[PDB]
Amino acid sequence: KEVVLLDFAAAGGELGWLTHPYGKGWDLMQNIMNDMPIYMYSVCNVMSGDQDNWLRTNWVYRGEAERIFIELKFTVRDCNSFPGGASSCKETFNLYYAESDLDYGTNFQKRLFTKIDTIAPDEITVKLNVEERSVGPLTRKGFYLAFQDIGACVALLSVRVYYKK
Amino acid sequence: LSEVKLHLDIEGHASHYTIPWTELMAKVPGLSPEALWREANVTEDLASMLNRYKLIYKTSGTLGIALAEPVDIPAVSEGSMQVDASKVHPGVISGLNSPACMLSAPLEKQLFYYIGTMLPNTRPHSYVFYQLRCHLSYVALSINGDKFQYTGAMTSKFLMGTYKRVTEKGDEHVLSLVFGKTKDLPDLRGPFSYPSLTSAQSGDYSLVIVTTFVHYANFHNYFVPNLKDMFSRAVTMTAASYARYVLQKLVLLEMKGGCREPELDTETLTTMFEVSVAFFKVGHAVGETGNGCVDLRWLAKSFFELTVLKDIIGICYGATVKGMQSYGLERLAAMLMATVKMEELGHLTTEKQEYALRLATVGYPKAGVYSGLIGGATSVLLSAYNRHPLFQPLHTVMRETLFIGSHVVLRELRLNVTTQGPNLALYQLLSTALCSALEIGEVLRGLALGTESGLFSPCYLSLRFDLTRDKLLSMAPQEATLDQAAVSNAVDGFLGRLSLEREDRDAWHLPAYKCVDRLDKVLMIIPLINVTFIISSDREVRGSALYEASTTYLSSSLFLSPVIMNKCSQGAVAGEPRQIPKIQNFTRTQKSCIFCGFALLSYDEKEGLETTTYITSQEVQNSILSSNYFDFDNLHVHYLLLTTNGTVMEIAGLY
Amino acid sequence: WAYPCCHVTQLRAQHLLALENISDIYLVSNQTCDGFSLASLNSPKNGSNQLVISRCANGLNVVSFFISILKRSSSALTGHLRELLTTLETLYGSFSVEDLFGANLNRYA
Ligand SMILES: *[C@@H]1O[C@H](CO)[C@@H](O)[C@H](O)[C@H]1NC(C)=O
Ligand SMILES: *[C@@H]1O[C@H](CO)[C@@H](O)[C@H](O)[C@H]1NC(C)=O
Ligand SMILES: *[C@@H]1O[C@H](CO)[C@@H](O)[C@H](O)[C@H]1NC(C)=O
Ligand SMILES: *[C@@H]1O[C@H](CO)[C@@H](O)[C@H](O)[C@H]1NC(C)=O
């Protein structure tokens, strides 16, 4: 069975995720898709170069989990549909986490997050990509997830964490 | 409000602009973006948008044809007084001959004074156009018992005629034509483009049709316009010429039964659009000169034609015209009519004669019905009748000049009473003298074909009442090249145009009219100075005297009753009628005007009255005598002579 | 932007922004969306989370709106403001509405 520790898309969701830098990075959005607001975090700085844009989750209590499974849903608009491609445009973004026993609140610090993998969509071109990664063993009271942008044109739609019991 | 930045990807990457609402919205009050934002259904699903785009009729094709714009308004005259139509000061212009143009900036403000809705929110326009409200002018009419309606609504930039019909059940079939410069056409709203809706285009002009495919089907049953010619006629002609073109159609039509009960055919609906264009082209050429100045002579002509066109559209369809009238021009024109001695207008060149008569009718609204304009039209006719070879059909140039001056006079006969008895009854007498068998000949020909000759003739405002159908048939063109049906028609219209009743521009204005018992038995009425004569077959007449020529033993009668000092009597003179005293002791060579102010009638014992001449000058007398006019070879034709003393005298021979 | 191609549907009550709370409008291109003239209306930022409310708009409509706004207010027309008008007209002229018949319109959402 799957026990959900975090689900961005659903259920009265995002409510607090941290952006760094404040304003010039990831952007929170709202747009009715079937008839309803589905919220998303997106950033497309594809022509400004040297982009280090962070999005940090709220604090997630570990519970019993040894290994969590991180489910990501996202679109990635390719660089070719921006004329000046392969110069300052990327088509990946980086997934990190950081374990903590305590809630550090808003005090985000980027030299304390470890990278998990590079997220690539496996079909760059309706094409809502679904990537899943697992991290373990988790050994603290809880953890954070963080999303690094290096200059891609990305929209995160669903971020779902669970463990198998 | 706020301000809005537009980020738009074009050429592959972002270009952003900023729309200031606050700033824009204060510089042009009357802008309501939130009302426009509503009119544009911005959350329209592409399904609903494409369905409504396929509701509007699209045009086949038929792209550009080389049409030449004419030269309508001339460049300002050499050293001209530029007149501000708002500030119309007295003395600004001294004379007719003085050059003058009227500033086109404040003139258009007066033509287009109205503000109303140009683009409604009614079903056919709510789909294609963004609603509009602007300074405009409209002709509007109603036929078929306020069921089929037309409104030609125009600005200085583009014209929109909109046809509408009601089907006894609520439905409304609507079709609109849009004419004007392409860049000056109103803003389209949906996915629409003008090339899909253009029915004709030439060199910055276009004719746009806007209607439903459904409504297009309805109209095609009774309205198949030649939109190519309507575009080519509307672009290539000058504003004045085109205006005359329309008013001739309506004037000739009206003499037929074409306006007592107008039909829903192609022609009548077409002319409805042509009517609107005629007003548009004038207001267009004025507005389209920008800030400038428009030659007063051009204005004198173009707006003359609009005044006469406005009139005929009212007495024919019952149409209303709001706008295209400027009080500045009416004041300016009336000023120049106090410059002119109406007693001697006929002494001017026949171009300034026409330039004065055109200002006379442009300036009538604020001139008064006791202005001496009547004498001016009477003067022109006299100078014309002196230089006219007797009994001949009027020339092209003369007939046009008299037509211009005639409208003034027709606003006396079609005006209950007057104070111009001397000049009016003189104009009506010279008109009775001008129209002979050959003048009628060229009019019927000019009517049968449709040319300018049938538009106007002095016979139309003359005193002849003996013009029965078969009387005219003995004067019609007999050439096989003409159509006898058109010639048969041409007689009726010509006979319809003089029928005393239900016309109201013929009679009941002379004080001698009272002494006639039967008003249908009159034949001809010659007013001279100090006497009028009442020639009729009617016996019971209160004239002073009474004469009977030996008419024949076929025809009813020929009586001649001279009314003295335009005062009738208390009962028909009794006893066997008098005898016309014959005259043989009279020589053909004269050196004096003894017959001045005398009419010289010429009739036939079977046919009836044939020719009338009023001897106004020594020249008119020399023509009669020196020519072959006196032909006694035919015994059936006698030559009466109507004096100012009230005596009728037959000339049977000469020396 | 980061999600250009949306689906236009009538908000149909009480979800509007109505252009008093619109501050940015994105217009897709002739090649960006396979020929669909789509727009996205946005708010400046809301509250703590700083979210930008976005609805999907019919491009051809919204384009023709600004075009008429400019024409209607032709006097003021600052140099770039009238360079928008000609950019908008050409952009509107770049899309074909007769190519929208041989297509599916629910391709998105
Ligand atoms: C807007 O479009 C919808 C279809 O999406 C239509 O039902 C509605 O009548 C339109 N609104 C107006 C004011 O025309
Ligand atoms: C009219 O007649 C009177 C007398 O009969 C005469 O004195 C007068 O001069 C006449 N008028 C004209 C214009 O001939
Ligand atoms: C943003 O919206 C929230 C409600 O979702 C409200 O609490 C907040 O005051 C808004 N921010 C403003 C009005 O600046
Ligand atoms: C795209 O736009 C260009 C001009 O910007 C035009 O030439 C081309 O035909 C357009 N493509 C289509 C499929 O209409």
Q: DSSP string covering B585-623, please?
A: ---S--SS-TTTT-EEEEEETTTEEEEEEE--SHHHHHH
B26 inside 8 A of chain C by CB: no
Residue numbers in B near A47 (CB within 8 A): 13-14
Contact indicator for C58, C38 with CB cutoff of 8 Å: yes
Contact indicator for B104, B294 with CB cutoff of 8 Å: yes
Q: What residue spans of B258-417 are helical by DSSP H?
A: 266-287, 296-316, 327-337, 352-362, 373-386, 396-413
Q: Count Cβ atoms within 10 A of the Cβ of residue B289 and give its class: 0-12 exposed, 13-18 middle, 19 or more buried.
A: middle
Contact indicator for B425, B510 with CB cutoff of 8 Å: yes
Coil vs helix vs strand at B554: coil
CA–centroid distance, residue B505 to ligand 4 (Å): 67
Task: State how far the Cα of C23 lies from the Cα of C11, in Å rounded to an integer.
Answer: 18
Residues of B with CB under 8 A from a CB of A: 11-14
Task: State how far the Cα of B508 lies from the Cα of B463, in Å rounded to an integer.
Answer: 12
Dihedral over Cα of B197, B201, B206, B209: its sign? negative
Q: Residue C10 is encoded by which pair of tokens?
A: 């009538």
B418 plus B277 within the same structural domain: no
Which residue puts its alpha carbon closest to atom 1 of ligand 2?
Answer: B530
Which residue puts its alpha carbon closest to atom 10 of ligand 2?
Answer: B530
Residue numbers in A near C32 (CB within 8 A): 81
Coil vs helix vs strand at B581: coil
Task: State how far the Cα of B453 lies from the Cα of B437, in Å rounded to an integer.
Answer: 15
B554 inside 8 A of chain C by CB: no
Start-to-end CA distance of chain A, whole Å, equals 5
Q: What residue spans of A9-162 are helical by DSSP H?
A: none
Which residue puts its alpha carbon closest to atom 7 of ligand 1?
Answer: B48
B359 plus B423 within the same structural domain: yes
Task: State how far the Cα of B77 lies from the Cα of B40, in Å rounded to an integer.
Answer: 49
Task: State how far the Cα of B283 lies from the Cα of B289, in Å rounded to an integer.
Answer: 10
Residue of B447, B451, B486, B412 whose CA lies nearest to B244: B451
Sheet containing B81-83: order of strands: B81-83, B100-103, B293-295
CA–centroid distance, residue B42 to ligand 1 (Å): 9
Which residue puts its alpha carbon closest to atom 13 of ligand 1?
Answer: B41
Do the chains contact at B9 and C81, CB–CB below 8 Å?
no
B138 plus B249 within the same structural domain: yes
Residue numbers in A near B14 (CB within 8 A): 47
Residue to substitute in B426, B530, B544 for testing ligand 2 pocket (most ligand atoms within 8 angstroms of CB): B530
B320 plus B344 within the same structural domain: no
Do the chains contact at B10 and C57, CB–CB below 8 Å?
no
Coil vs helix vs strand at B413: helix
User: Around Cβ C18, how many Cβ atoms within 10 Å?
Assistant: 12
B571 plus B493 within the same structural domain: yes
**Residue B530 CB–ligand 2 contact under 6 Å:** yes
Domain residue spans in chain A? 1-165
Task: Determine the Cα angle at C67 with ends C61 and C72, to 5°.
Answer: 120
**Residue C46 CB–ligand 3 contact under 6 Å:** yes
Q: What residue spans of B435-561 are helical by DSSP H?
A: 437-449, 469-473, 484-496
Residues 35-54 of C with CB under 8 A from B: 36, 39, 41
CB contact set of B488 (below 8 Å; sequence gap of 6+): none
Do the chains contact at C52 and A42, CB–CB below 8 Å?
no
* Residue B299: C-alpha distances to residues B80, B106, B280, B366, B522 (Å): 14, 14, 14, 17, 43
Nearest CA in chain C to A30: C53
B31 plus B74 within the same structural domain: yes
Which residue puts its alpha carbon closest to atom 8 of ligand 4?
Answer: C94
Nearest CA distance, A85 vs chain B (angstrom): 11
How much of chain B is helix, strand and coil, in % rounded to 5? 35, 20, 45
Residues 34-63 of A with CB under 8 A from C: 34-35, 39-40, 42-44
Find the domain containing B611 and state its range. 326-655
Phi, psi values for residue B608, rounded to 5°: 115, -160
Q: What is the DSSP letter of C83?
A: H
> How many CA atoms does the CB half-sphere of B463 hold within 13 Å?
30
Instruction: Report CA B108 to chain centroid distance, whole Å.
Output: 23
Find the domain containing C37 and state its range. 1-109
Phi, psi values for residue B7, rounded to 5°: -100, 120
Nearest CA in chain C to B25: C73
Which residue puts its alpha carbon closest to atom 6 of ligand 3?
Answer: C47
Which residue puts its alpha carbon closest to atom 2 of ligand 4?
Answer: C94
Residues of C with CB under 8 A from a CB of A: 1-4, 6-7, 9, 11, 15, 31-32, 40, 49-56, 107-109
* Ligand at shortest distance from the CA of B11: 4
The CA dihedral of B341, B343, B346, B352, to the nearest 10 degrees, is: 20
Please tell me the total count of domains within chain B.
2
Q: Count Cβ atoms within 10 A of the Cβ of residue B14 and give its class: 0-12 exposed, 13-18 middle, 19 or more buried.
A: middle
Residue of B406, B608, B432 whose CA lies nearest to B510: B432
Phi, psi values for residue B102, rounded to 5°: -110, 120
Dihedral over Cα of A7, A10, A13, A14: its sign? positive
Residues 63-92 of C with CB under 8 A from B: 64-69, 71-73, 75-76, 80-81, 83-84, 87-88, 91
Please tell me the total count of domains within chain C.
1
A106 inside 8 A of chain C by CB: no
The CA dihedral of B388, B393, B394, B397, to the nearest 10 degrees, is: -120
Q: What is the DSSP letter of B76?
A: P
Do the chains contact at C109 and A34, CB–CB below 8 Å?
yes
Q: Residue B511 is encoded by which pair of tokens?
A: 């004080």
Ligand 4, atom nearest to C90 Cα: 5
Q: What is the resolution of this structure in A?
A: 3.0
B313 plus B364 within the same structural domain: no
> Considering CB atoms only, which of C10, C22, C73 is closest to B45?
C10
Q: Is the peptide bond before B106 cis (omega within 30 degrees of 0)?
A: no
Residue of B19, A37, A43, B14 whose CA lies nearest to C23: B19
Q: What residue spans of B387-524 are helical by DSSP H?
A: 396-413, 421-434, 437-449, 469-473, 484-496
Contact indicator for B207, B227 with CB cutoff of 8 Å: yes
Nearest CA distance, C10 vs chain B (angstrom): 5
| Residues present in chain A in total | 165
In b/e form, how buried is each residue of A59-96, taking b as 16+ CB within 10 angstroms? ebebeebeebbbbbbbbbbebebbeeeeebbbbbbbbb
B339 plus B321 within the same structural domain: no
B10 plus B148 within the same structural domain: yes
Q: What is the DSSP letter of B119?
A: E
How much of chain C is helix, strand and coil, in % rounded to 5? 30, 15, 55
Do the chains contact at B12 and A47, CB–CB below 8 Å?
no
* Ligand at shortest distance from the CA of B598: 2
> Considering CB atoms only, which of B2, B31, B44 is closest to C8?
B44
Protein residues whose CB sits closer than 6 Å to any atom of ligand 4: C 30, 94, 96
> Considering CB atoms only, which of C28, C57, C75 is closest to B43?
C57
Task: State how far the Cα of B559 lies from the Cα of B551, in Å rounded to an integer.
Answer: 9
* Ligand at shortest distance from the CA of C37: 4
Task: State how far the Cα of B573 lies from the Cα of B143, in Å rounded to an integer.
Answer: 52
Do the chains contact at B11 and A84, CB–CB below 8 Å?
no
Residue of B522, B483, B533, B499 whose CA lies nearest to B608: B522
B275 plus B313 within the same structural domain: yes
Task: State how far the Cα of B134 lies from the Cα of B202, in Å rounded to an integer.
Answer: 26
* Residue C27: C-alpha distances to residues A26, B8, C105 (Å): 21, 5, 18
CB contact set of B548 (below 8 Å; sequence gap of 6+): B557, B558, B559, B560, B577, B578
Do the chains contact at B12 and A83, CB–CB below 8 Å?
yes
B339 plus B286 within the same structural domain: no
